Amino acid sequence: VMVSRITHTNTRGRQVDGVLVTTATLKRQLLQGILQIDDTAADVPVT
Amino acid sequence: IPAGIIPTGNVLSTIEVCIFF
Amino acid sequence: RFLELGLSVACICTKFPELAYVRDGVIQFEVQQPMIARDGPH
Amino acid sequence: ARVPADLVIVGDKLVFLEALERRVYQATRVAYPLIGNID
């Protein structure tokens, strides 16, 4: 369900769509040359 | 010594060209 | 022209009108050797 | 203050990448470290 009141978005404003969880080994191994960074921070609600 | 001068600060020395006559 | 040419960045062009009468000329440099500060007193 | 100094991203954290061999260790009679050797 697309329900939200205030959601998590990037710096630009486009809404994020999910979360992926792993250990930092695959963080660095995927970040080095496989996947592309979008930004460093994001907009997050406080409630 | 009474210094009273700027403390160097990357001294720009002068090139002197010498003329013989 | 010479200065607008990119090769002129390898030269320092300076006017010297009183040059045809030069017999003679010398220039001097006073480079000195920098020292590392070894801490203990010797 | 603003001082010219290179800087490079690696992993996920920003690190200075320095090869301090020019600003120091010229015309001075101390050998450069990091050149240990091996047997």
Next chain:
Amino acid sequence: PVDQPVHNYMVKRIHKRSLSAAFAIASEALSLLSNTYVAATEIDSSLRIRAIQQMARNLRTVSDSFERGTADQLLGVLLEKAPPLSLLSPINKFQPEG
């Protein structure tokens, strides 16, 4: 009921270093110094400024030598303050609890 907070208090030894450098002076420089210290109608201003300029040049060279050597000493101590990657990383990875 088995959990409890735990605290760790580490204390450090401060170690000790120093500095030293050589800086020689000629007797003629001191002699022209003496008249310039009492600068008056006498004492050639051109020679006095020449001598003070040369001495200040040498003094600032030997002074900046200190900041030049500070980096040397610090890089040396960090180089002496490091284990190899090939000996730290395997324990860093292959030790879940100890």
